[PDB]
């Protein structure tokens, strides 16, 4: 139905994002029980790696566009994550290695994440039909890969270790590369201007010199949170002043606060409504007992079902606000299933946790897959890396946030965790049906601006 | 998944006996494991358990009597019973449940062991 490089990157792309999940999926836990971190510290350093991660991605479009080339920077930063890892499974022979390794998967990160999109859109002439399709059959892989790594990955860690789990997150990129290398004929004449001209070596080496220090940049920055939040505020505040100073901007920004608040929202599904499921949920659903960290894995599974159909389905702001209005429900419903549907022992059916997550997806399915794209259409460099910083410091937010549900390690009774989950879940979801309705009441202005 | 109980036996009022529970395949760490009893013609009750952080839960009526404890190198759980009574006699569970919560009723944990003959005599 599409050309063939598409299903190579179709498959890239899905064995890269199952070794990113299958670390994301089981982070805050390993930071619990593997590291002894308190849920507190384990929510906000989770924060800091989740900022790192999403504000990096600026760097990978750069760097494939203009240093090194859209391929060739696809086979780096497949590398540098790789290399993360299995640094990660190394962390547990010596544990003082944990931030290096976390840090290289954020750079690694950085470094791929851009890229693979790019290439698809040069695999279709300017103006294919073929697009869209291709493009949410490519945001489907991202979430098979999601899906398979959330749920498989709590288990293998459970069973084999962590050290297991890491080396196969890694194993998976090494297949992602093996997938791409046995394919490189498939996109011989598919490329940035940099992937056709013999590679610099003078920016490989600034390249990798600015990737390693911001491999200890990171590590530093998630050791130390306490600093950079001080580094995210000042840089907020100041690219706010200079945005200030320098209409159609103004609805950007509009759009980036409203994001912001998305993110903090999808910030809490590794941490706080990972330990909800832990603490409050029964752990059995259809009959079957699952590992409750796998619940995370119902975000991409209704993503997988879910984006097809709302393909075969106002316009941009009207978008903007559903999604908000979907987000505050979710968080909503977590808080009326621990209020009133809950065990006489604390414990709430897992159908309510499989509600929160569709009304979670569906909120992703209206913003961020649908955001910077127009973005992009009412926008340029400095905007792209506002909003990268924006997003960065709303999973920090996020981290913060997901603390007020910490609970200390002694506590063992589901009805002392169940009304700290249900007071801020609740709350979450007041705030954010009250930012719903401010979005909706400036649908009017904002569709307005961008005639 | 299946977890496998050792110790349980028959002693005198006041004497001790100690109960363990061990797992196959997943590392019991990750597991809050309760001690469930049921005596002749009641029902499962919690008695005590360590979470997966060594929090402690216990019926009132066994606390300064049972201690709940984990060899997380060995992977077991054990239960001490000191100053046992005849009203302690019963079959004991051991479960287990993913995570910190060590919930009352045995509906809140996945996996079981078979179970283990107590008996008190006075």
């Known amino acids: 139905q599409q050309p063939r490089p598409f299903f190579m990157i179709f498959f890239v792309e899905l064995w890269e994002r199952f070794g990113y999940y299958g670390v994301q999926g089981v982070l805050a836990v390993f930071f619990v029980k593997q590291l002894g971190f308190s849920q507190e510290q384990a929510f906000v350093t989770f924060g800091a790696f989740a900022a790192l991660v999403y504000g990096l991605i600026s760097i990978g479009g750069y760097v494939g566009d203009h240093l090194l080339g859209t391929k060739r920077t696809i086979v780096l930063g497949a590398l540098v994550l790789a290399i993360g890892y299995f640094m990660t499974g190394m962390s547990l022979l010596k544990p003082d290695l944990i931030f290096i390794a976390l840090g290289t998967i954020a750079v690694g990160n950085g470094l791929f994440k851009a890229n693979p999109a790019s290439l698809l859109s040069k695999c279709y002439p300017p103006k294919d039909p073929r697009l869209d399709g291709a493009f949410t059959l490519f945001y489907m892989s991202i979430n098979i890969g999601s899906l398979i790594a959330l749920s498989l990955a709590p288990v293998i860690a459970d069973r084999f270790g962590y050290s297991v789990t890491y080396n196969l997150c890694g194993a998976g990129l090494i297949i992602a590369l093996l997938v791409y290398i046995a394919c490189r004929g498939m996109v011989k004449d598919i490329g940035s201007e940099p992937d056709f001209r013999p590679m610099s070596f003078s920016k490989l080496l600034y390249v990798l010199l600015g990737s390693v220090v911001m491999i200890f940049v990171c590590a530093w920055l998630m050791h130390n949170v306490e600093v950079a939040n001080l580094v995210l505020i000042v840089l907020s505040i100041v690219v706010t002043i200079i945005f200030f100073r320098q209409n159609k901007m103004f609805v950007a920004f509009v759009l980036m606060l409203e994001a912001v608040v998305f993110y903090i929202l999808y910030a809490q599904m590794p941490t706080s409504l990972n330990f909800f499921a832990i603490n409050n949920v029964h752990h059995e659903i259809l009959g079957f007992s699952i590992n409750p960290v796998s619940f995370q894995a119902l975000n991409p599974f209704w993503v997988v079902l879910a984006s097809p159909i709302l393909a075969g389905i106002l316009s941009m702001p009207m978008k903007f606000t559903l999604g908000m209005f979907m987000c505050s429900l979710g968080f909503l419903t977590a808080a009326a299933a621990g209020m009133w549907f809950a065990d006489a022992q604390g414990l709430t059916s897992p159908w309510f946790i499989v509600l929160v997550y569709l009304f979670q997806s569906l909120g992703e399915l209206f913003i961020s897959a649908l955001g910077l794209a127009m973005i992009a259409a009412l926008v340029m460099g400095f905007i792209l890396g506002m909003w990268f910083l924006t997003q960065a410091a709303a999973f920090l937010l996020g981290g913060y946030v997901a603390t007020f549900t910490a609970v200390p390690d002694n506590i063992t009774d589901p009805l002392e965790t169940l009304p700290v989950y249900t007071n801020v879940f609740g709350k979450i979801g007041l705030v954010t049906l009250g930012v719903a309705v401010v979005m909706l009441l400036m649908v009017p202005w904002l569709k307005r601006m961008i005639a | 998944v299946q977890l496998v109980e050792s110790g349980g036996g028959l002693v005198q009022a006041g004497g001790s006996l100690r109960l363990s529970c061990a797992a196959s395949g997943p590392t019991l760490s990750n597991y809050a494991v309760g001690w469930f009893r049921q005596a002749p013609g009641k029902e499962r009750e919690f008695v005590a358990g360590?979470?997966?952080?060594?929090?402690?839960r216990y019926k009132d009526v066994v606390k300064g009597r049972f201690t709940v404890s984990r060899d997380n190198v060995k992977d077991t759980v054990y239960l001490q019973m000191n100053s046992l009574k005849p009203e302690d006699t019963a079959v004991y569970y051991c479960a287990a449940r993913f995570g910190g919560m060590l919930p009352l009723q045995p509906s809140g944990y996945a996996n079981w062991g078979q179970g283990t003959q107590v008996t008190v005599s006075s």
């Open positions: 360590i979470n997966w952080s060594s929090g402690l």
